[PDB]
Each structure stands twice: as C-alpha cells, then as structure tokens.
Amino acid sequence: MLKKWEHYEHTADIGIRGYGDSLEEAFEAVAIALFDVMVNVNKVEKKEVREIEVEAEDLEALLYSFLEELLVIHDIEGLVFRDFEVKIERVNGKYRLRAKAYGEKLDLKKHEPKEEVKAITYHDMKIERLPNGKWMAQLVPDI
Ligand SMILES: [Ca+2]
C-alpha cells in the first residue's frame, strides 16, 4: 500500500456564550461562562469583590478587554468569580464598561478545578441583539 494521510475533525478550544435581557446581562453571563471553563462556577461563593473599568472603540474590543482583565485578576490573585454587575455607557466617543466581580479565592477541594484559560481571543466573537430582543455574547477562548 502507498502511504496516505488525512485531516480529521476534532474539538478546538471551547466556546463560551451568554444570553441576557440586555447587553449588560449578556456580558455578565458570558463572564460566568468563562469562569465555568476553569471551575464549577456553581461552587464559587461571593466573598470578595473586584471592580473593573475599561474603555474601547467598539463592543467587541470592550468585551475582550473586560474578560481579559478578569483573566488577569484570576492569574495574579487566584480569584474565581460567580457573578458580575456590568454597566456600559458612551463617554466622549468611546464605550466605557464598569463592572463588579463577585467571588473568592480558588479552593482546590471545593471548586472542582477543570482547565485554565490561556487567553481571551476574538475567535468566533459575536455580540448581537437577537430577533426576540434578547442579547447574546460569545467567543472561543484559548485553552
Ligand atoms: Ca488552545
């Protein structure tokens, strides 16, 4: 037989997606999804808070920036987060996001650690108002 080769389909990273009644709630929800890649997010208690503020020229960059700062907090302080309060406004020609992130220190016995997220990316990123008036935010982070 002559040697032969092929490509085949396999999972590549993982998709995260949030839905909400508002853009802000979709951002909150997809951030929960992000932490559920790393731990069982349902096991994360709200003991500590960190605040985020970022500006961007468009909503995609805003979402990237928000999630990447959450990842950085996670990487530096070892915090994991359960929920978020997000506010998005227009200020002097930019989008401004402010958020409160609620969570606690990683607990290896309790949080059911899964896999770390290496980086937020723009891969498959989409933010949209669906025909039914709900909002969706998604992306495929690098794991
Ligand atoms: Ca990867």
Author numbering: 1 to 143
What does the publication say?
Here, we show that Archease and RtcB from P. horikoshii do indeed function in unison, and that Archease affects the catalytic properties of RtcB. Archease expands the cofactor specificity of RtcB, enabling the efficient use of dGTP, ATP or ITP.
The crystallization buffer included CaCl2 and the omit density map showed two Ca(II) ions per asymmetric unit, with each Ca(II) ion bound to a single Archease subunit in octahedral coordination geometry. The metal-binding sites are identical and consist of two strictly conserved aspartate residues, the C-terminal carboxylate group and three water molecules. The metal-binding site is located at the interface between two subunits, subunit A binds a Ca(II) ion while the analogous residues in subunit B are not in a position for metal binding. The Ca(II)-binding site resides at the base of the N-terminal protrusion on the protein exterior. The electrostatic surface potential of Archease is dominated by regions of negative charge.
